[model samples]
Target: RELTVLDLHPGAGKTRRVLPQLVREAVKKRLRTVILAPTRVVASETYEALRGEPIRYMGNEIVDFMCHSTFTMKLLQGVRVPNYNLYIMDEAHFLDPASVAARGYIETRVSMGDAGAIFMTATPPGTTEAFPPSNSPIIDEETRIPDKAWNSGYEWITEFDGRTVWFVHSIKQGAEIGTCLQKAGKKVLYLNRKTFESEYPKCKSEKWDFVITTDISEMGANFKADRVIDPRKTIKPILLDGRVSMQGPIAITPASAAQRRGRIGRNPEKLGDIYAYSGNVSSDNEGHVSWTEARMLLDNVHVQGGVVAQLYTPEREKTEAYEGEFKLKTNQRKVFSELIRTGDLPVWLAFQVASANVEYHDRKWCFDGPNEHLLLENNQEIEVWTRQGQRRVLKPRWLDGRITSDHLNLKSFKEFASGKR
Candidate 1:
C-alpha cells in the first residue's frame, strides 16, 4: 500500500470517524500504525478523543501518536523510534520541499516505502510542477477521489463586524496587531506559535472581542468568530534565511483563501464573513484534485505570508557558514531551518551555559545538556549547569515579544544573543 491521498471535508469524520476505521483494519492485519498530526497539541487532543475505541488507543505498544516536529527531531537526533508498518499523516498538506524540517522528515521517511501511508488534507494542493520537486508531493490517490458535493451551510459576507478573528503571517505580526487593537480598548486574545502553548487554554471561552492567530489556526484548528480577516493581501517585507526573500508581497491562492473562509459560518445560526482582498476571488475553488498530479505539485493554497520567510535561504549562506561566519549546532541549525516549525523552542544555550563550568563532567547538563529534550508545547522545568552551580529554571516563553529584555537578567542568554546584528 503506497501513500494514498484522501479528499475529505472539514468536520468530515476524518480523524474521529475515518482514522478509527483505518486503525481497526491495520490491527486486523497486525500492523503497527503511527498517526502523525501536525502538532503535539492536536495529537494529544485526538488521543483523548479516541480513548474509548480499542483499536484507536494511542500510547499503546502497537498504536502511537506524534506531531511532525517531535517525529522529525527523533529522527534527526538518532533516537530509537519504534518500527511501524503503517503511517497516517493528518493535515498532510504541510508536506513541501521548501519547508526544511518537513522536507527533511519526508526525506528520512521516504526510505520507509514498504509501509502503508496516508496523506490527508482539506485544502488540496495546486497543479503539478508548481514548486521544487519533493519526495512526497501533494498527490492524492488517483483511484480514491470521493465524489460528493455537500452543502457548506454558511454564507460569505464582507462586512467586518462583531467579534472577529484576524490572521497574520508571523508571531511578530500577530502581536503587533493585537497590541494596536488593545490600545483601542478592545479585548484581544493573541495567539502565535509560541504563545499558543501557554495561551491556548484561554481560547475556548467567549471572553475576548478579537482573536489574533497565526497559521496554527489555518492548519485545521477551528476557532469560532463572527468575522474572519485574511491578511494575505496586507503584505510586508519578508526576510528569508537571513536575507530578503526573492518573492515579494506573497498572496494566498484560491485553495488557501477558501480554506480561511471555510473556518467561519460552520453553524447555521450565525452568519459569518471573511474579509480579504479582491481580484481573483472568483467562487471557483476545489472539491477534488488528482493524486497523480499531487506528486508533481507543491501546496499552492497556503502561502499565508508566513511560508515565504521559511523558504530555503539563498546560496550565499553556504559560503558564509563554511568560512566560519555563522555558527549553529545541529539542534539550533534545524530550529531556524523551518520558520514555520510550530511551537516549542529547544534551549541548546542552557547546555552550553552549564558546560562553561569545569565541574561539568560530573554534571548531567555536561553530557545530556540541561535535560535538553524537545520542548513540547507545554513549558518544561530544565536544569542549567552554571559557573556558580546548577540553576534549574522553567523554559522562558519563546514567543513573547519581550523575551530577551523581560526575562534575560541572566546573561548566558545575553551572551548567546549578544551583539545585535
Candidate 2:
C-alpha cells in the first residue's frame, strides 16, 4: 500500500480520535507499526495517549507496539529483519527539509522494505519535492483546510466599564502598558517563546488574567482569557558599550497580528475580545486601526495566515544533504583523516579536540563535517555535535533559573566533577 498523509486541523482531536482508530485497524491487520514523534516530550505524550490500546510502547523489548523519537528511529535503522510494516510521523511538518534530522529519518523509512507510511500533521510541508516517487505519496493525498469564516474581529473587553472598548497603542509601548496593567492588579498573560514554556503553568496556577504570548497560542493552543493584548511594536535598542543603537523596530506581519487577536475569542457562544494595546495609533485621534484595515489584517472573513512563505522556501542545502555528496574543507579533511587512523579514541572527544583548534566566528555558518561511517559529508554534522555540548552547559542553568542564583557560585572546580551545586 502507498504511504498515507493525514491532513487534519489542530484542536480537532486528531491525536485522540483519528490516530487510535488507525492504529486499531493497522494492528488488526497484523502490521508491525511504529509511530515516530518529533521530540522525546512528544514521544512520551504520545505513549500516554496510546498506551491503553493493547500495543507495545517500545521502551524496552516487551510488546508489539512502539512509540519512538525520530532520533531513536535513526539509531534502530539497522535492526536486521525489522518487522516495521507501518510508519507514522506525528507532527509531520517537522519532516521539512530545513530539519536535517527529520529528512534523515524520512530517508531511513523510505529505504525500509515496502513499509506503509503515514505522515500526520496539522500543517503539511509546503513542498513535497524533497520526497521522490517512492516517498512522494504525500502529494497524492487529499488535504483538508479549516473553515474560519466566523473567526472575525476581537470583542475587546475593558475592566473599567465591564464592557467592550476599542483602544490602540504603539507596539513599542506594549511592555510598558503590560507592566502598568500588572501593577493595577489586572491579570496579564505574557506569551513569548521562553515564557510560554517557563510561565505557562504560572499563568494557569496564579489565575493571572493579564497575559503575554506569541505565535504559539496563535497556532493551536487555546486560551480562554478575556483579552489578547499585543505589546510588540517598537524594537528596543541594545546598549553596546553604553551606546544605545537600534537595529530595527519590531513590526508584526499582517498575518501575525491576526493570530494574536484570535487567542481571545475561543468560546463559540461569546465574541473573542482582543485589545490592540500597541500598534500605530493614527493622527485622526482614532486609538485603534481603522475598522476596515483591522478587518483585512485579521483576514476576518478567511483565516489564511496559518501558512506563510517561509514554509515554501526551504534551504537548498538542507534538501541536497540527503542526496548530494558534500566535500569537506582542508582542516576538516585533516581531522577526518586523523580520526580514521586513531579509531581507538572516542569520536566525540576527537571531534571536540578538532573543533577547539578552529575558530568559527560566523554564527550563521552551517556546520559541514564529513561522516566516517557513510563516507559522506553533511553541513549539519559538526553543528549538531557543537549544539549537544552547548545544551549540556546551558540546560542546567535554565532549569534552575526560577529557584536559585547560587548554582553558579562554586568554590574551586571541585563541585563541577561532583555534579552538585
Candidate 3:
C-alpha cells in the first residue's frame, strides 16, 4: 500500500520533467531512496534533473567515485545530517539474488556500509516477479503518471464524446509519421524506438521541434520535434522479450478506431477530437495501404468477426465468444490457410530461427539470415537447422509483429481462471 505506480494511462516521457515533485515528496518523507535504472542514459537523464536538489553525484565534487573520499564515506557512515534523506537507484529492479550486477553492487554498498537503499526502473527484469517483501519497488504506478496539464498550453488528457478511451490499431508505413503530428498539433510527441530507427531515417529533416528519446535516443540529451511519432509496431517484440519502452505511453486520436481511446486533452479547443486507427492485414505491407483500407481493417471488426465465429464454432451455440473475441486470429488463420494451411506463419516461424534483424528498405522486410534455417522453406526445417546451429528465434518487422504462443497464454489463463459459468 505504501508504493503505487499510476503507469500514467498516458505515461511519463524520458526527460526528467517530473523530478522536482518527486524530490519534494522524497524530502518530505525524509526517506533515503536509491533508484537503479537499466541504462547509463537513464541514470544520466535522471541525474541532471536531481542534481539541483542538493543530492551528491558520486563522481562529482561531492562524493567521488574514485579515491573513496572521506567526506563521501562520512555521508555513507550514516552520521545524522539534515536534508540527506533520499537516495535514488536507476534500473533498481536488476537486484536479483542471482545477478552478478546485483551481487557486486551489494558488496560495494556493504563495503561502504550504507544503510539507505532504494531501487527504480521502468522495465523490471523477470527476476522481480519475486522480491523480498521488504524490498519493494521504489517507484509506484501513480507517481509516474504524466501531469494532467503542463504549465505550457499543451493539454495532457484529450477525451472524446461517450467514452474516454479508444484504440488506434492499423497504422501503415510510407506515410510520413509527421502526418499524425499535423493533427495533434505541431508539438506532438511520438514514443517508439523503431519509429526513430526506421521512420526517422527516411525523413529528410532534423527539424523535430521537441524530440523524446527512447532506447534510440542517447542519455542526457534532448531533441526538439514540432511533432513526435511513436511507432507502436516496435513495442510488441520488446514486450515479448520481457522488456518495455522506458519511453512511456503512446498518444492516439479518436477519429481512429480502437477499443478505447484515452487521450489527455492538452488543448482546450481541440478538446474531444481524438482518433484511433485500427486495421488487419494479410501481408506485411499493411502499413503501406491507404487510410481507407486501414480503416476497413478496424471498422469491419464487428461484422467480419461475427461471420468468423458462426463458421468456426463447433457447439453452434449463440455464444460465439471465442471466435468473436479472436477476430484477428480467425482472420489471420484464414488468410494463411486460404492458400496453404496456416499460411506463411510456418515459413515465418522458420524464417525467425534463421534470420537476424531485418533492414527496412522502403518498408520491405529484407534482413538476411546467416543460418541454414534459411535452407528449408518449411518451419520444421528452419527449426531443426536453427536448433543445430544454436541460433534462437528472432522476429523482424517484415514478419509483422509476432502474435506468438507467449501471448497465447491469455487463452489458457482464461480457460483456467477467468471465472466459471
Q: Could you give the C-alpha RMSD of every candidate to the true structure, in order shown?
A: 14.0, 16.6, 20.7
Rank candidates by lDDT, best first: 1, 2, 3
Considering lDDT, which of the candidate structures 2 and 3 is the better prediction for this target? 2
lDDT score, candidate 1, position 239: 24
Q: What is the lDDT of residue 60 in candidate 1?
A: 49
List the lowest-lDDT window of 10 residues for candidate 1.
139-148
Name the better of 2 and 3 by TM-score.
2
Ranking of all candidate structures by their TM-score, best first: 1, 2, 3
Kindly report which residue stretches of model 1 are placed more than 4 angstroms away from their true locations once superposed: 54-60, 95-113, 125-161, 183-185, 233-249, 253-256, 268-421
Candidate 3 lDDT by residue in tens digits, 1-421: 1222212211244225544566556656755544434344444556666665645543222221111112222222223332223333433322111121232233234334443433333332222121121111111111112222233342432221122111112222212333443455544333342344443432234333333333233121233211222222222222123212111223321111111111222222333333222222111211221211112122222321123212111112212123333223433433322211112232232223223232111111212334421222223322211212433333223332222222232232222121111
Higher-scoring candidate on TM-score, 1 or 3: 1
Instruction: Please give the range of 10 consecutive residues that has the lowest summed lDDT in model 3.
Output: 134-143
Backbone collisions counted per model? 5, 26, 67
lDDT of 2: 0.37
Each model's lDDT comes to 0.45, 0.37, 0.28
- The TM-score obtained by model 2 is 0.46
Q: Candidate 2's residue-wise lDDT over 228-251, tens digit each?
A: 445433222222331223333445
Q: For each candidate, give its TM-score against the true structure.
A: 0.55, 0.46, 0.29
